[PDB]
Amino acid sequence: MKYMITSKGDEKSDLLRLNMIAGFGEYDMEYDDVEPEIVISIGGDGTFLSAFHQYEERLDEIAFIGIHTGHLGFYADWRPAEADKLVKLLAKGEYQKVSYPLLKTTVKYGKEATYLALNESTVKSSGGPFVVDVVINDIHFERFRGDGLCMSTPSGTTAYNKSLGGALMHPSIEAMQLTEMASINNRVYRTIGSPLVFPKHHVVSLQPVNDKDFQISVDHLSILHRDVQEIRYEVSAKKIHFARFRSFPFWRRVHDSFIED
Amino acid sequence: MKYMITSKGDEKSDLLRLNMIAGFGEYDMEYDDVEPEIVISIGGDGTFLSAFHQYEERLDEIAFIGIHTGHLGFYADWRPAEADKLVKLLAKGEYQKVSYPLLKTTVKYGKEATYLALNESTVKSSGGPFVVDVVINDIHFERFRGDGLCMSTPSGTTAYNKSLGGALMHPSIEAMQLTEMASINNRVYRTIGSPLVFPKHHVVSLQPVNDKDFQISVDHLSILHRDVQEIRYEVSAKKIHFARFRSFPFWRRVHDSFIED
Amino acid sequence: MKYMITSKGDEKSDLLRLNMIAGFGEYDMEYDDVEPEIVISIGGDGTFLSAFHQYEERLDEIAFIGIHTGHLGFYADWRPAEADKLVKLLAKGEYQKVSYPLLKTTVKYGKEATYLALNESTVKSSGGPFVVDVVINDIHFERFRGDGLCMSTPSGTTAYNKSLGGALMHPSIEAMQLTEMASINNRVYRTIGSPLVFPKHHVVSLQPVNDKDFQISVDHLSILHRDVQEIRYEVSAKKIHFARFRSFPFWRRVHDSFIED
Amino acid sequence: MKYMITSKGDEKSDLLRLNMIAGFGEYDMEYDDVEPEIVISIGGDGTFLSAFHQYEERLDEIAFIGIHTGHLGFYADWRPAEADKLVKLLAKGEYQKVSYPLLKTTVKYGKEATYLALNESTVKSSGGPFVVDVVINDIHFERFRGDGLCMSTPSGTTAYNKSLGGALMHPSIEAMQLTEMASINNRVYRTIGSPLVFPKHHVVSLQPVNDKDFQISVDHLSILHRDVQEIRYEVSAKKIHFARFRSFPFWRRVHDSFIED
Numbered sequence A, B, C, D: 001m002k003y004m005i006t007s008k009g010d011e012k013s014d015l016l017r018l019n020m021i022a023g024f025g026e027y028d029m030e031y032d033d034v035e036p037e038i039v040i041s042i043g044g045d046g047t048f049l050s051a052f053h054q055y056e057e058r059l060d061e062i063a064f065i066g067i068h069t070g071h072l073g074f075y076a077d078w079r080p081a082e083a084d085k086l087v088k089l090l091a092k093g094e095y096q097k098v099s100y101p102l103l104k105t106t107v108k109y110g111k112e113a114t115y116l117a118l119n120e121s122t123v124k125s126s127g128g129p130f131v132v133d134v135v136i137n138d139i140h141f142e143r144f145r146g147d148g149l150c151m152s153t154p155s156g157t158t159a160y161n162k163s164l165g166g167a168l169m170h171p172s173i174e175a176m177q178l179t180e181m182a183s184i185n186n187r188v189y190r191t192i193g194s195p196l197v198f199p200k201h202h203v204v205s206l207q208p209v210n211d212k213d214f215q216i217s218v219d220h221l222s223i224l225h226r227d228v229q230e231i232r233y234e235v236s237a238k239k240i241h242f243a244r245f246r247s248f249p250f251w252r253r254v255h256d257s258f259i260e261d
């Protein structure tokens, strides 16, 4: 159907994109980057992230495919040499779609802004000390003092979540995971420490205690928010759809990226 | 209906059991510890664990209730002073049942033995070095060298799993979580490090590399197994049912047990 | 001899300062905040830190004493009710001095600036990704990718170092300790992970790989540095001297601050 | 002078030993495994550990050298191909000696046994729960509940200590480091969590609370001790001496063993 291709912008990725476009010209494939049904990302995981946010308002109409030009990307699971075979299989169709959960961040002021994340959503202070009350389904759970917090999707658990001590979570689990960044823990201040895994329909809310300015980052897009009254986290109802042409299981993907390949 | 009561065995718990029995005599409640429909545990989490394994062959016919005589137990969420009010509400009935996932361990030899866990199932070596290949859905994932491994249920994540760096997982998530015990990690030997969370129908298998003798512990019941060929982990199809009479959410339970109460 | 007193600035601390000054008027004690020999800090650990940096150019001529107005501070080990007994013992003299090691940070450009730390010296990126080569005594040790790094004094190991997984180190050990902040670790990027403890005369140097702008914080005083060519860490030759009037051992101080008091 | 050579016992190591002996026959070198002045270990770190304990009663009269037949050992820093050049340099002499601190474990009963460790000394329970009071210089510091504890030398910090979260410590620092094994931490039971680094002349003592049987392991030599009244740890006055023929710094050794080589 309709398709488009984003590139990292370097020489290698642009040429691959041009060759794939020329290969798509030899089928009934129309290039359309306004209402594509197939979005192809050529680059790394960052490039795939940019492609996701570029089309986040049409997630139900789009299937994503990643090609990695450098080393294996977690979302870009195709080597450049397989691009010709990918063009052919994609042209025919009859591929199966695979869906991963997403995370919804809502920021309220004193107005409401919402964001969608594929990796994670983190919160820090705008300079001063970060102090927030953590409220789970309207129950006050803890007062957090430290560098910040990170709320991860399942496919995000192998990213920033992993470096903060979080657990790696299979993407068929509709959940989100909260991890701490350097929390204070003494006789006066104490947090849970452990990562927390939340199911669908649970709401985690952050409430300022003193400072109301926070730096919020959704998939490394970092925005300063002033006069913040609440940050709410929940598993989104929207999902990202991947076009898959062969078996590449998640735990094998994890093995290749972290153990050996 | 039919019911029975287990006690920690100390003076305080025995007297509470006797008083509850006398209180049950004033209703249409028959004491039966062969085919009870209600099992009451008076003691700590250990006592509740013993009650679970005592009746693990009738989990679908039984609802559990825990009373804690010492401090708050995670499974024993009733104070002794509320025992009279518990007798009354239980006598009427019309309570709602709450189900938690369980973990199935299978041990093969050179014959098959299976176990059911409510907290976790761990594996260590019988003295020599512990070395196992970790296989996920028939895919070889890693070779583990270290002290041992721990596979946790959701309600178990606040137990041994928590002390090994695992994530705390809400019990409505049908999953199991694998955590490492002091793994070797240098240029020659390397593991994933991070905890792993597996959904229903995923099978994690441990395969010996050299030594075939392992000490396997299911809910602190520790058994030596010789001539072991495989240990398989998967989320059980069986579930434990709790009788609940009021709202005591999991994250509030976690807050009380770890933050403050 | 000569003395001065810094206060947190709230009502409670100002009144305590005024009362101690009036008590010092009844001895041969001259108030002098230009060349004091005794510096008294009334507040928390932050107030003590400010007092240290206010007089860092006369460390060999000054002994410090901390009074904590809120909860126990690690450096402020005197309760306000003991202020009168402290005035008396200090007026007589014949107290013993205790010395803690300090950390020297040197920043080079493309010029040289040096800083002295009592808790720690940390480095982050000015927004972009933080990537530095870590060089130990002119040996290239690792390339670090992550949120940042923290170099701690011994008395600092119970502060930020503690929240990043570092070890707690007795202050009689002339050393410094380096800990990571959320490092990337996969098949392509890998760091040591473990904290590193360095003796006197060892030099740890950070060298930029791409971005040359870093946010450097010495005892929570955070400064942006542009066009950075090198950050060098080493145990200082200067030491801070505490006046002590009774036995309050470090591990007891640690017990009171973290286990129970 | 006098010398002897221990081998791992496999074919490769025995032949190397025989060739080195024949090479030593061509100098004024007498083979003597009763009172050697030079001890050569051919194998891995385990083989070097066995050589250390074989001659622990003559540490001041002996210099050690390790040759690694498999991958790089931390104590065995010579490749087999350099054995001929090692024979020659050792025959001449005029080499410089390098000393590493050691750890002294003392076990008291209801009699006294002492052990010397080069890597570490650990303590576990003989089956039941491990519960000990931790006393630092006669000050009660904490009650530990968990799997066990590990007290490490500096050169041991890259071994078991590393896998338990401890810090890596340069061997010129006369110290010992204590790390936890899976400690219980909730509202009722709490430990320090962080590793602890102790200087020379500090004494750490473990005192049983209930069970008095402990499994104590000194450099992987594991002994059951019954009727235990106290386990005392302190930096030994004895030191191990290494013969060094060229610069191979500790942090380079660490880089090669963990980052890349």
Ligand SMILES: Nc1ncnc2c1ncn2[C@@H]1O[C@H](CN2CC#Cc3nc4c(N)ncnc4n3[C@@H]3O[C@H](CNC(=O)NCCNC(=O)C2)[C@@H](O)[C@H]3O)[C@@H](O)[C@H]1O
Residues within 6 Å of the ligand: A044, A045, A046, A047, A049, A072, A073, A074, A075, A119, A120, A155, A156, A157, A158, A159, A160, A161, A163, A219, A220, C129, C130, C145, C146, C147, C181, C182, C183, C184, C185
């Ligand atoms: N302190 C920290 N430690 C560890 N990770 C941290 C971190 N701070 C942020 N992040 C993670 O970077 C994401 C944003 N960036 C693109 C990516 C993607 C990714 N997504 C996944 C996934 N789902 N699973 C497995 N690997 C994944 N990756 C892998 O990360 C490696 C690069 N990481 C870097 O940090 N660069 C420096 C700053 N970031 C960027 O400029 C752009 C690449 O190898 C890439 O392939 C965020 O969304 C965070 O998650």
Ligand SMILES: Nc1ncnc2c1ncn2[C@@H]1O[C@H](CN2CC#Cc3nc4c(N)ncnc4n3[C@@H]3O[C@H](CNC(=O)NCCNC(=O)C2)[C@@H](O)[C@H]3O)[C@@H](O)[C@H]1O
Residues within 6 Å of the ligand: B044, B045, B046, B047, B049, B072, B073, B074, B075, B119, B120, B155, B156, B157, B158, B159, B160, B161, B163, B219, B220, D129, D130, D145, D146, D147, D181, D182, D183, D184, D185
């Ligand atoms: N090194 C280690 N560190 C941390 N935990 C470890 C551990 N080794 C094993 N275990 C856990 O003990 C369970 C078995 N025992 C009864 C319990 C239950 C429990 N279940 C839950 C739950 N689901 N959620 C939250 N808290 C829970 N608890 C809390 O543990 C505290 C006691 N722990 C102890 O270890 N005693 C010493 C040895 N064990 C026993 O004799 C009996 C009590 O406070 C009890 O209330 C196992 O199944 C493991 O999980």
Ligand SMILES: Nc1ncnc2c1ncn2[C@@H]1O[C@H](CN2CC#Cc3nc4c(N)ncnc4n3[C@@H]3O[C@H](CNC(=O)NCCNC(=O)C2)[C@@H](O)[C@H]3O)[C@@H](O)[C@H]1O
Residues within 6 Å of the ligand: A129, A130, A145, A146, A147, A181, A182, A183, A184, A185, C044, C045, C046, C047, C049, C072, C073, C074, C075, C119, C120, C155, C156, C157, C158, C159, C160, C161, C163, C219, C220
């Ligand atoms: N993410 C993080 N997690 C943990 N600590 C972090 C951190 N970021 C920074 N720091 C540490 O704060 C120091 C600077 N601040 C005064 C202090 C002193 C201190 N010194 C010691 C010591 N030597 N030993 C034991 N406790 C000590 N304390 C204890 O820290 C508690 C407050 N901590 C806070 O963070 N406030 C928010 C930001 N900071 C400030 O505004 C002022 C007080 O209880 C105080 O008594 C820095 O130098 C860092 O070390």
Ligand SMILES: Nc1ncnc2c1ncn2[C@@H]1O[C@H](CN2CC#Cc3nc4c(N)ncnc4n3[C@@H]3O[C@H](CNC(=O)NCCNC(=O)C2)[C@@H](O)[C@H]3O)[C@@H](O)[C@H]1O
Residues within 6 Å of the ligand: B129, B130, B145, B146, B147, B181, B182, B183, B184, B185, D044, D045, D046, D047, D049, D072, D073, D074, D075, D119, D120, D155, D156, D157, D158, D159, D160, D161, D163, D219, D220
């Ligand atoms: N759960 C655990 N996780 C991590 N380490 C653990 C551990 N349990 C115990 N140990 C450490 O094994 C030592 C005893 N063994 C010889 C060694 C030496 C060593 N010494 C050093 C040093 N100073 N610095 C850096 N590396 C060093 N090594 C490296 O350890 C690798 C093997 N480790 C193994 O465990 N084998 C299984 C059991 N042990 C043995 O049969 C024999 C080899 O690569 C060897 O070269 C102990 O003394 C402990 O320290």
